[PDB]
Design a protein around this ligand. Structure first.
Ligand SMILES: Nc1cccc2c1C(=O)N([C@H]1CCC(=O)NC1=O)C2=O
Ligand SMILES: [Zn+2]
Length: 105
């Protein structure tokens, strides 16, 4: 249980080693304006995604950061968001825990 894959298809996405304690905890539970609750795990790094469009600050869960939707690059499943434009770090990924599968490298 060291690498994270897309639950829907298997695409390699991230690694346990790349978890990022933002504000002291890698896990942040948040809601969007449609009321959907997400258990977001922050990662300093991820691969295998497709980052869609240009960034937006609207509704951002992380102060100082703008977001882009992050899809699985293989199957299109919405896996989370890429955050940029901030500070320490300038960028990171916020991925929806239950949309990944954990397993051996
Ligand atoms: N405006 C809408 C409308 C529908 C769904 C979402 C947003 C929205 O902003 N986010 C996220 C994007 C990422 C973020 O940081 N905050 C959000 O509320 C959504 O899931
Ligand atoms: Zn996928």
């Amino acid at each position: 249980a060291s690498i994270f894959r897309c639950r829907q298809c298997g695409q390699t996405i991230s690694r346990r080693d790349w978890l990022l304690p933002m504000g002291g905890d890698h896990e942040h539970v948040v809601f969007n304006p449609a009321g959907m609750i997400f258990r977001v795990w922050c990662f300093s790094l991820a691969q295998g995604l497709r980052l869609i469009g240009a960034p937006s600050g609207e509704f951002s869960w992380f102060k100082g950061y703008d977001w882009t939707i992050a899809l699985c690059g293989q199957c299109g499943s919405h896996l989370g968001w890429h955050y940029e434009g901030g500070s320490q770090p300038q960028t990171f990924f916020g991925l929806i825990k239950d949309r990944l599968a954990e397993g051996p490298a």
